Design an enzyme around this catalytic site. Structure first.
Site, PDB file in Angstrom:
ATOM      1  N   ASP A   1       0.839  -1.192   0.000  1.00 22.32           N
ATOM      2  CA  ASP A   1       0.000   0.000   0.000  1.00 22.32           C
ATOM      3  C   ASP A   1       0.881   1.251   0.000  1.00 22.32           C
ATOM      4  O   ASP A   1       0.733   2.152   0.831  1.00 22.32           O
ATOM      5  CB  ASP A   1      -0.972  -0.016   1.188  1.00 22.32           C
ATOM      6  CG  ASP A   1      -1.803  -1.310   1.260  1.00 22.32           C
ATOM      7  OD1 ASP A   1      -1.193  -2.391   1.429  1.00 22.32           O
ATOM      8  OD2 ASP A   1      -3.053  -1.251   1.150  1.00 22.32           O
TER       9      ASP A   1
ATOM     10  N   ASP B   1      -1.796  -2.698  -3.825  1.00 22.50           N
ATOM     11  CA  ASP B   1      -2.150  -1.285  -3.770  1.00 22.50           C
ATOM     12  C   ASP B   1      -0.945  -0.425  -4.114  1.00 22.50           C
ATOM     13  O   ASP B   1      -0.134  -0.095  -3.241  1.00 22.50           O
ATOM     14  CB  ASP B   1      -2.726  -0.901  -2.408  1.00 22.50           C
ATOM     15  CG  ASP B   1      -4.194  -1.268  -2.269  1.00 22.50           C
ATOM     16  OD1 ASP B   1      -4.747  -1.059  -1.172  1.00 22.50           O
ATOM     17  OD2 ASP B   1      -4.795  -1.773  -3.249  1.00 22.50           O
TER      18      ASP B   1
ATOM     19  N   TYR C   1      -2.701   4.168  -5.920  1.00 21.66           N
ATOM     20  CA  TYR C   1      -3.930   4.811  -5.451  1.00 21.66           C
ATOM     21  C   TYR C   1      -4.442   5.852  -6.448  1.00 21.66           C
ATOM     22  O   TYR C   1      -5.154   6.794  -6.083  1.00 21.66           O
ATOM     23  CB  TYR C   1      -3.730   5.427  -4.074  1.00 21.66           C
ATOM     24  CG  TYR C   1      -3.594   4.391  -2.991  1.00 21.66           C
ATOM     25  CD1 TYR C   1      -4.660   4.094  -2.152  1.00 21.66           C
ATOM     26  CD2 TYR C   1      -2.405   3.697  -2.816  1.00 21.66           C
ATOM     27  CE1 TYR C   1      -4.540   3.151  -1.164  1.00 21.66           C
ATOM     28  CE2 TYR C   1      -2.277   2.749  -1.832  1.00 21.66           C
ATOM     29  CZ  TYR C   1      -3.344   2.483  -1.010  1.00 21.66           C
ATOM     30  OH  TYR C   1      -3.215   1.535  -0.032  1.00 21.66           O
TER      31      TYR C   1
ATOM     32  N   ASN D   1      -6.806  -4.198  -4.095  1.00 24.15           N
ATOM     33  CA  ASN D   1      -8.131  -3.698  -4.449  1.00 24.15           C
ATOM     34  C   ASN D   1      -8.075  -2.356  -5.162  1.00 24.15           C
ATOM     35  O   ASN D   1      -9.019  -2.016  -5.880  1.00 24.15           O
ATOM     36  CB  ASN D   1      -9.028  -3.580  -3.212  1.00 24.15           C
ATOM     37  CG  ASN D   1      -8.394  -2.763  -2.102  1.00 24.15           C
ATOM     38  OD1 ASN D   1      -7.241  -2.993  -1.731  1.00 24.15           O
ATOM     39  ND2 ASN D   1      -9.145  -1.800  -1.565  1.00 24.15           N
ATOM     40  N   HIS D   2      -7.002  -1.589  -4.983  1.00 22.24           N
ATOM     41  CA  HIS D   2      -6.912  -0.322  -5.699  1.00 22.24           C
ATOM     42  C   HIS D   2      -6.459  -0.515  -7.133  1.00 22.24           C
ATOM     43  O   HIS D   2      -6.614   0.398  -7.943  1.00 22.24           O
ATOM     44  CB  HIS D   2      -6.000   0.649  -4.945  1.00 22.24           C
ATOM     45  CG  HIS D   2      -6.685   1.313  -3.793  1.00 22.24           C
ATOM     46  ND1 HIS D   2      -7.342   2.519  -3.914  1.00 22.24           N
ATOM     47  CD2 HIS D   2      -6.871   0.910  -2.515  1.00 22.24           C
ATOM     48  CE1 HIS D   2      -7.893   2.833  -2.757  1.00 22.24           C
ATOM     49  NE2 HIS D   2      -7.622   1.875  -1.892  1.00 22.24           N
TER      50      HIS D   2
ATOM     51  N   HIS E   1      -3.136  -9.764  -1.134  1.00 22.92           N
ATOM     52  CA  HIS E   1      -3.410  -8.419  -0.644  1.00 22.92           C
ATOM     53  C   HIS E   1      -4.146  -8.442   0.693  1.00 22.92           C
ATOM     54  O   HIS E   1      -3.728  -7.783   1.654  1.00 22.92           O
ATOM     55  CB  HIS E   1      -4.218  -7.621  -1.652  1.00 22.92           C
ATOM     56  CG  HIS E   1      -4.331  -6.176  -1.291  1.00 22.92           C
ATOM     57  ND1 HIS E   1      -3.224  -5.379  -1.068  1.00 22.92           N
ATOM     58  CD2 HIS E   1      -5.413  -5.388  -1.080  1.00 22.92           C
ATOM     59  CE1 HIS E   1      -3.619  -4.156  -0.771  1.00 22.92           C
ATOM     60  NE2 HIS E   1      -4.942  -4.136  -0.763  1.00 22.92           N
TER      61      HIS E   1
ATOM     62  N   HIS F   1     -10.501  -1.779  10.572  1.00 19.29           N
ATOM     63  CA  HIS F   1     -10.569  -1.565   9.132  1.00 19.29           C
ATOM     64  C   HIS F   1     -10.399  -2.884   8.386  1.00 19.29           C
ATOM     65  O   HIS F   1      -9.419  -3.603   8.597  1.00 19.29           O
ATOM     66  CB  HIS F   1      -9.484  -0.576   8.712  1.00 19.29           C
ATOM     67  CG  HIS F   1      -9.723   0.065   7.378  1.00 19.29           C
ATOM     68  ND1 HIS F   1     -10.984   0.375   6.914  1.00 19.29           N
ATOM     69  CD2 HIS F   1      -8.859   0.471   6.418  1.00 19.29           C
ATOM     70  CE1 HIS F   1     -10.885   0.946   5.726  1.00 19.29           C
ATOM     71  NE2 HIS F   1      -9.607   1.014   5.402  1.00 19.29           N
ATOM     72  N   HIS F   2     -11.371  -3.210   7.531  1.00 22.02           N
ATOM     73  CA  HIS F   2     -11.361  -4.433   6.729  1.00 22.02           C
ATOM     74  C   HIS F   2     -11.398  -5.694   7.582  1.00 22.02           C
ATOM     75  O   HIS F   2     -10.948  -6.754   7.134  1.00 22.02           O
ATOM     76  CB  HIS F   2     -10.144  -4.482   5.796  1.00 22.02           C
ATOM     77  CG  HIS F   2     -10.052  -3.318   4.868  1.00 22.02           C
ATOM     78  ND1 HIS F   2     -11.002  -3.059   3.904  1.00 22.02           N
ATOM     79  CD2 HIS F   2      -9.125  -2.340   4.756  1.00 22.02           C
ATOM     80  CE1 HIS F   2     -10.663  -1.970   3.239  1.00 22.02           C
ATOM     81  NE2 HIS F   2      -9.528  -1.516   3.736  1.00 22.02           N
TER      82      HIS F   2
ATOM     83  N   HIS G   1      -3.394  -4.140   2.568  1.00 23.15           N
ATOM     84  CA  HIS G   1      -4.800  -3.749   2.635  1.00 23.15           C
ATOM     85  C   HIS G   1      -5.128  -2.975   3.908  1.00 23.15           C
ATOM     86  O   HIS G   1      -5.742  -1.900   3.842  1.00 23.15           O
ATOM     87  CB  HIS G   1      -5.704  -4.978   2.525  1.00 23.15           C
ATOM     88  CG  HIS G   1      -7.123  -4.659   2.172  1.00 23.15           C
ATOM     89  ND1 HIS G   1      -7.458  -3.715   1.230  1.00 23.15           N
ATOM     90  CD2 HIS G   1      -8.289  -5.195   2.603  1.00 23.15           C
ATOM     91  CE1 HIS G   1      -8.772  -3.665   1.109  1.00 23.15           C
ATOM     92  NE2 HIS G   1      -9.301  -4.551   1.935  1.00 23.15           N
TER      93      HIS G   1
ATOM     94  N   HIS H   1      -3.916  -0.571   6.752  1.00 26.01           N
ATOM     95  CA  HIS H   1      -2.827   0.405   6.758  1.00 26.01           C
ATOM     96  C   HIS H   1      -2.188   0.468   8.147  1.00 26.01           C
ATOM     97  O   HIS H   1      -2.289   1.453   8.880  1.00 26.01           O
ATOM     98  CB  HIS H   1      -3.339   1.753   6.271  1.00 26.01           C
ATOM     99  CG  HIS H   1      -3.853   1.702   4.869  1.00 26.01           C
ATOM    100  ND1 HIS H   1      -4.874   2.505   4.414  1.00 26.01           N
ATOM    101  CD2 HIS H   1      -3.504   0.910   3.826  1.00 26.01           C
ATOM    102  CE1 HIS H   1      -5.121   2.223   3.147  1.00 26.01           C
ATOM    103  NE2 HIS H   1      -4.304   1.258   2.768  1.00 26.01           N
TER     104      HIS H   1
END
Ligand SMILES: *[C@@H]1O[C@H](CO)[C@@H](O[C@@H]2O[C@H](CO)[C@@H](O)[C@H](O)[C@H]2NC(C)=O)[C@H](O[C@@H]2O[C@@H](C)[C@@H](O)[C@@H](O)[C@@H]2O)[C@H]1NC(C)=O
Ligand SMILES: *[C@@H]1O[C@H](CO)[C@@H](O[C@@H]2O[C@H](CO)[C@@H](O)[C@H](O)[C@H]2NC(C)=O)[C@H](O[C@@H]2O[C@@H](C)[C@@H](O)[C@@H](O)[C@@H]2O)[C@H]1NC(C)=O
Ligand SMILES: *[C@@H]1O[C@H](CO)[C@@H](O[C@@H]2O[C@H](CO)[C@@H](O)[C@H](O)[C@H]2NC(C)=O)[C@H](O[C@@H]2O[C@@H](C)[C@@H](O)[C@@H](O)[C@@H]2O)[C@H]1NC(C)=O
Ligand SMILES: *[C@@H]1O[C@H](CO)[C@@H](O[C@@H]2O[C@H](CO)[C@@H](O)[C@H](O)[C@H]2NC(C)=O)[C@H](O[C@@H]2O[C@@H](C)[C@@H](O)[C@@H](O)[C@@H]2O)[C@H]1NC(C)=O
Ligand code: NAG
Ligand code: NAG
Ligand code: NAG
Ligand code: NAG
Ligand code: NAG
Ligand code: NAG
Ligand code: NAG
Ligand code: NAG
Ligand code: NAG
Ligand code: NAG
Ligand code: NAG
Ligand code: CL
Ligand code: FE
Ligand code: FE
Ligand code: FE
Ligand code: FE
Ligand code: NA
Ligand code: NA
Ligand code: ZN
Ligand code: ZN
Ligand code: ZN
Ligand code: ZN
Lengths: 424, 423, 425, 423
Positions: C128, C157, C160, C194-195, C279, C288-289, C316, C318
């Site tokens: 990321d 990622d 972005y 995913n980005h 990822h 988160h996630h 994924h 952060h």
């Protein structure tokens, strides 16, 4: 119709599962160090690999090519393979095997000598072969020729499959199996004729040359062509230019532009013999297709004079005709100069489209024989262009009704670049 | 040389976010009941929808088209739209608008009358336009014509963008924006010239006509052509056959085969005026490009005579010429018969490639003027073919150095089918 | 928005007409004898030829590759070149040049040593990344690390760019230029995040991963994968498997099928360190996630235990997290066995998705720390997997707010095949 | 291998030159006013046109479609036609004819009523059909059903052609001819099963669902799906959602993204019955494929409960199972909440993959029968979802060994939006 029946021995399918068939080869590059190997498999895609080795070095090598298929109306093709063997040795027998996964078939060829001034070489000349019984004896006359052709210059109209209902493309497969006994062992240099056009909008088949182009690849990028239908190769002492009579050739078009530049790249100090192939003859005193060559002739004939082309071979007319060296390039619309004159810088124009087609000969000639025509005869047969050295090449024509060593027409060519003298 | 600078008024971008630009129309069907609306947006793809309505029955309808893009070397096109409006009423004013998703622009056209034997119609004749200052004067003269042209028969060589480095396709865009003021309102019937070929393997651009064929569409399927570079349309009393000098035309080729069938479909009691368009002239007495047309002539001249084509229009030569009615179709290699001869079944061959190009005129002529040549001049200008009825069509040539009502050359065409007398 | 502005020094265009930019390399074969060389030219197509030579010998060879372009909405790419240098020598510095027609730029790389049991190698771990000021700091820490990373394992990622309007793909070009200072000299091993998906049907962009896949090629066919988004490479003593969280993995799908066969092909007696890159983390105690990895865990977790994967790296989230060796594969819907248990055959699950992104850390974690989570912290940083030999690899985590040489977290790995002793801290 | 031999009567080729075979129809729009008409001609391309007219008014119209072909290893397909008839009247019997150019065949179908709250409709449920003799029996029981099905919901695994050497795609052509006697007259709604994946890298077939996707089209665009493997239609009082177990469904992926937005578009005041189709069951107490649905379940189960899906149909397990209304959505890894509990917002999950396949039944069940499993039996058969109104639908399971009027299992579904009681 004199076409050979589907059950003929020449159309036999080779035995064994997925056995490669319709094997055929042609020069794969510009100077002769390469070979395109082509074959069809009918049972499953199979491997596009080619195993090969020279007699000299006996090291088995693999080249990998590509497979393709096509459909034409309700016909669906087998699996077509094209593989290029590169960096070959000059003047060397190679063996090559196709069908490495399934059942393997083995063939061989001889690379030409490196290009050079005095390198001798014997070209077969065949046009409008077809698959009639006449076609079969012409091929027999070629393969039994004591002059031993080493490469065939093929001037168009291959299988005549478009004469069949919906252009029955099985007649391409039969033609490929039939011609294999020659073209699998020596290159044929392909010219596109009008029977390859196969423009059939009524059955929604509107891409010209589609079957022909899938089945027969040419090394056209080697000479910076953008199309398989016009291209050049060098082989031994000859530089061969293949044109397309039914492609565009107006000024500024790709074929026109490529020919203009290609005639300037010709180096007669390396390849003294300058040979042009097209399907439709620019000189022709037969009634059949009388004056169809006029269009291309007006565009290119002066260029053939300028660059001192030695000989132009064509087919299309189903007969034999050999011109005098003449040109008809003085015309300016209103000056009345429309008669061909003797021109010792011109090529000889030879119509050799008499290899059999579907069994019909073109007999009707304009009478009397025009001044520009030197020899002509409505017989089946094939030609040989036997290059001796930089100055001399011997052209002969063999009739199907004669013995295979008999020459019914025969003339020495004096090279236009290295020895320009009235060879008449 | 004399090409208008990029900041010329004629090249101004229409204001507004993604405002349609380079708007142009042409006949969308065989008989005139359809129109191809074409345009370009530069900011984003936008909508290919076209809203249209007649000034009469006034219902606002929507046609949908397709968008497409291309690249040429290091040039990336905008988003090109082509949309066909079908089932129009004959002989009525329509309004159409483009750019519905954001900035909309509105134009109009007037559908032709239904095809018929005695329907008058006025064709502008423009070839080799380009974008020089002369180009702009030619276009002004055409628009201010008292004749009032209703359609442009365009004999090829449009933008001349190939003269620029890497064929700078921005010069297609500028030419599209320059010509918009005419072709957004009346059809131009497109012929392909040699500057449209843009064959450039040195920059790996090897598809003939690529930029032209993305940008200018034609109703070629309406006449069962398999290619946009040859096709036919009917408009009022004219049957117009468009040919491709720079495509294959040998015996058995698509174009050869199509034209051979197409002449058999001509009905002179429905469209008595048979007009052929091609880029390269078959008769040309200028030095530049002299006898380039010989190849196509050997193939097609005898058909034009067989079918009594009224006129053949061509460009390519940057000048004006009008032939006599001649043919040169009796040659047989050895019979010695290679001189054009007066022939009242033949068309008149008109070279009209003098709209301006990049500012250069072809002035050197074959001397003396051959008998097949009636009138020739090295001046910029345009032509008008003004059909009065089944017997008479008035052709006039207007020069840029003249006033817009001035005809430096003028001649009555007597119809080859209904009134074939010496003209 | 902590993204570095467009005129930052890291986004500067290399000077000279049609100069190659966004130069990046990655392994181009299964074993390390090949490199994919990749770069973009903006002014004209240019040549896809790569001149290269060994610092040792010096014979200057050419490899020819291919140019491709793409459009994305109203953006048009420059000319993207991918060329594979093959048949290279192991353990050898090579120089290479691109833009042979006009402006030439020269770089170098070192081919990995031949695969073997005790071959050491240091892998960097970055996820990321993005193009924020934090992203720049992580990259600086990586390249300045006293243990010199020789290959980057990148867990997805990238740019972005999809956060920008119309996914403004200009932000792909800037990220290529920014990361060039590392990936032009040592391969980065790409995982799709995913980005990268960039599913934007509102602007008629419906092909997943389209920008990413044009710009970043991988040698996926070398492992008989049929898709770029899952594939395997071997480098030094590591067998690395790259999975696609955002591709199909149901039973019988291509990725499921490929992973199934690929695990049978692993040989721990020729490449002892088995590493998995994906990822989306299977184990993650961050909010988160949270639990987004359950679906893939359901399909593959038991295979990782069966084949004794050493470590699974993901991004994924952060933040940073290291798990215990833990498994949760005994659940039968009605048997209540839904709790992770210590399992010395299981891999370690490491979340290393904290290289910077667009400047946001994920700090809200589940409390108290679950038994399966060994160490976790919401700070920007990167990781190092330093293989010493067949038995031992040292993993360490370096924080941006710390010196370049200080490991905020670190742990010795005992290879699951060659030293299968509990190594829990 | 209880597959029927190639010379079986159900595989008869319709006589006559280029006679259309493998005729099949499905809904062509979102709401039911359109029909996709599909068929295969074997002798030549033939015309993709469909002539159709209502039994009401004999106004014969023509719909024009598209032809495609494919290859698979050494198999070459015939000519595949897909043609959408649009703008049909609701609740109307239409005739349609295919094979216009050559041998014509005539069929019919009846459009559904306009979508609406209390519109009754009977849905056949069929899964994993294949082409064994068992398969032929199930299809007989469906077409002989006294409840009279009006549309089949097909939960995947069609031909099982991929069990043959090289997936011998002749077994696709044979299945099309066999199913024709039903699916040429009423739509079947297609779900892709795993036997449609046909991922065969060994023989260089690496594109999932290729033969299936060529032969069976779905109106996936009508629900703004970007892929034929997930999509929704509305029919009478039903909103039907087809998911793809073997495509991507991770967060952010197309299918996942699509399902999120599609549920928001469901209007229970217009389509009270919300039905989900997928191949692999999320609830399954058989040993075969046990827990293969967990992955999709973890992603989608909470959505089903949140939107109060009435029933989810799957196949894949070659047996019959009906669950209780349960959810398993409370799990948080460390909270221990992993057992399914009864939940009156949850759907009923029915496995109905027992239509015959290649003649094998899945009989090995997890013992004891878990609490979430209401009823389950290893016998061949089919189901019927008979909607009476907004509150009631009757589901029944007919076995191949029973007579066609016998229901071996049958429950009343009480509508989760209009009438959510413990059924
Ligand atoms: C190039 O090939 C020509 C044909 O083979 C040679 O002419 C042949 O020369 C032979 C003597 O070596 C002689 O017996 C043949 O009759 C003769 N054939 C013909 C058709 O002329 C030619 O040789 C030169 O030219 C001829 C005319 C004689 O003067 C020879 O003595 C010359 O060497 C070959 N050229 C060279 C350079 O070898
Ligand atoms: C077709 O249009 C022609 C040009 O407009 C007509 O000829 C013109 O007729 C005028 C009176 O209608 C006359 O003043 C013009 O001098 C004459 N123009 C020319 C160039 O001759 C033509 O009219 C017919 O033909 C002429 C020759 C006369 O005989 C008239 O009486 C005729 O009606 C138009 N043809 C028809 C059939 O109307
Ligand atoms: C494999 O790499 C390991 C990590 O570097 C080696 O262990 C390290 O050995 C160092 C000296 O050899 C010693 O100072 C370090 O403390 C130690 N590190 C750890 C984390 O234990 C290992 O060397 C063998 O194993 C260790 C336990 C010592 O006994 C060494 O003396 C051994 O040789 C390396 N294995 C081999 C076979 O070299
Ligand atoms: C929806 O259809 C149901 C099934 O036909 C209706 O219930 C049925 O009503 C019949 C009276 O017309 C009765 O004989 C049946 O036994 C009964 N069947 C069942 C399974 O209940 C239902 O009718 C309404 O709802 C039920 C609960 C009763 O209260 C009826 O009296 C109601 O009319 C139909 N619902 C509607 C809204 O039409
Ligand atoms: C012999 C036969 O029927 N099929 C074979 C196939 O099993 C194999 O892949 C290969 C054998 O070398 O070639 C073919
Ligand atoms: C073709 O010719 C070859 C060689 O002369 C001969 O063996 C073969 O039988 C002939 N076949 C036919 C059909 O003429
Ligand atoms: C395909 O291959 C199989 C086995 O090799 C063979 O039996 C079958 O007939 C082939 N099918 C076709 C259409 O060639
Ligand atoms: C082009 O012509 C128009 C009309 O004569 C005029 O308004 C315009 O200024 C001209 N532009 C140029 C650049 O000549
Ligand atoms: C694309 O569209 C966006 C949104 O209007 C705009 O800001 C941007 O400048 C456009 N880019 C190009 C290259 O046209
Ligand atoms: C263009 O139109 C769309 C649709 O109406 C709108 O959403 C968008 O904001 C517009 N763009 C600009 C730059 O106004
Ligand atoms: C294309 O190349 C020329 C230089 O060769 C340059 O001047 C021009 O701006 C380029 N165009 C684009 C769009 O990069
Ligand atoms: C790029 O290189 C080519 C060939 O070396 C040359 O023709 C061209 O002028 C160069 N471009 C520029 C902008 O210098
Ligand atoms: C990025 O980091 C480098 C140090 O590695 C520094 O030289 C550069 O100025 C930094 N740029 C930004 C925008 O932070
Ligand atoms: C193609 O059509 C003709 C029509 O008579 C038929 O005889 C022939 O068998 C067909 N070929 C194939 C391969 O179906
Ligand atoms: C299939 O079932 C139908 C109806 O019961 C019957 O007529 C037909 O003969 C059966 N065919 C086979 C092969 O079982
Ligand atoms: Cl699954
Ligand atoms: Fe012939
Ligand atoms: Fe011009
Ligand atoms: Fe991220
Ligand atoms: Fe099944
Ligand atoms: Na020309
Ligand atoms: Na010709
Ligand atoms: Zn011919
Ligand atoms: Zn021109
Ligand atoms: Zn992510
Ligand atoms: Zn299944």
């Amino acid at each position: 119709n004199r076409d050979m029946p589907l059950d003929s021995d020449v159309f036999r399918v080779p035995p064994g599962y997925n056995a490669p068939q319709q094997v055929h080869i042609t020069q794969g590059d510009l100077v002769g160090r390469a070979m395109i190997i082509s074959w069809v498999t009918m049972d499953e895609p199979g491997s596009s690999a080619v195993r090969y080795w020279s007699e000299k070095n006996g090291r088995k090598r693999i080249a990998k090519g590509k497979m393709s298929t096509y459909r034409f109306f309700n016909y669906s093709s087998g699996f077509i393979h094209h593989t290029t063997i590169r960096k070959l040795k000059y003047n060397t027998k190679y063996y090559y095997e196709v069908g490495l996964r399934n059942t393997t078939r083995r063939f061989s060829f001889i690379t030409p000598p490196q290009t050079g001034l005095d390198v001798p070489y014997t070209f077969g000349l065949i046009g409008d072969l077809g698959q009639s019984f006449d076609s079969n004896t012409t091929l027999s006359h070629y393969e039994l020729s004591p002059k031993k052709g080493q490469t065939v210059l093929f001037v168009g109209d291959l299988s005549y499959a478009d004469r069949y209902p919906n252009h029955d493309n099985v007649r391409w497969d039969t033609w490929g199996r039939f011609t294999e006994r020659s073209v699998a062992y020596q290159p044929w240099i392909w010219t596109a004729g009008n029977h390859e056009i196969e423009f059939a909008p009524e059955i929604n088949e509107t891409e010209p040359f589609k079957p022909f182009s899938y089945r027969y690849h040419v090394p056209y990028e080697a000479s910076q062509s953008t199309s398989p239908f016009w291209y050049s190769i060098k082989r031994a002492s000859a530089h061969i230019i293949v044109l397309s009579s039914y492609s565009a050739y107006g000024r500024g078009t790709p074929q026109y532009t490529w020919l203009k530049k290609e005639l300037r790249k010709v180096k007669r100090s390396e390849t003294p013999w300058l040979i042009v192939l097209m399907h439709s003859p620019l000189y022709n005193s037969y009634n059949h297709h009388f004056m169809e060559g006029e269009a291309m002739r007006t565009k290119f004939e002066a260029w053939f004079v300028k660059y001192k082309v030695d000989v132009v071979f064509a087919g299309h007319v189903h007969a034999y005709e050999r011109s005098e060296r003449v040109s008809n390039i003085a015309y300016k619309i209103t000056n009345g100069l429309c008669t061909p004159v003797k021109d010792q810088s011109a090529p000889v124009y030879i119509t050799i489209g008499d290899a059999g087609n579907y069994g019909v000969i073109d007999s009707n000639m304009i009478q009397p024989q025009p001044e520009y025509s030197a020899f002509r005869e409505a017989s089946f047969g094939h030609g040989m262009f036997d290059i001796k050295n930089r100055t001399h090449a011997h052209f002969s024509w063999n009739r199907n009704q004669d013995g295979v060593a008999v020459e019914a027409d025969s003339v020495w060519f004096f090279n236009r670049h290295w020895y320009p003298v009235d060879d008449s």
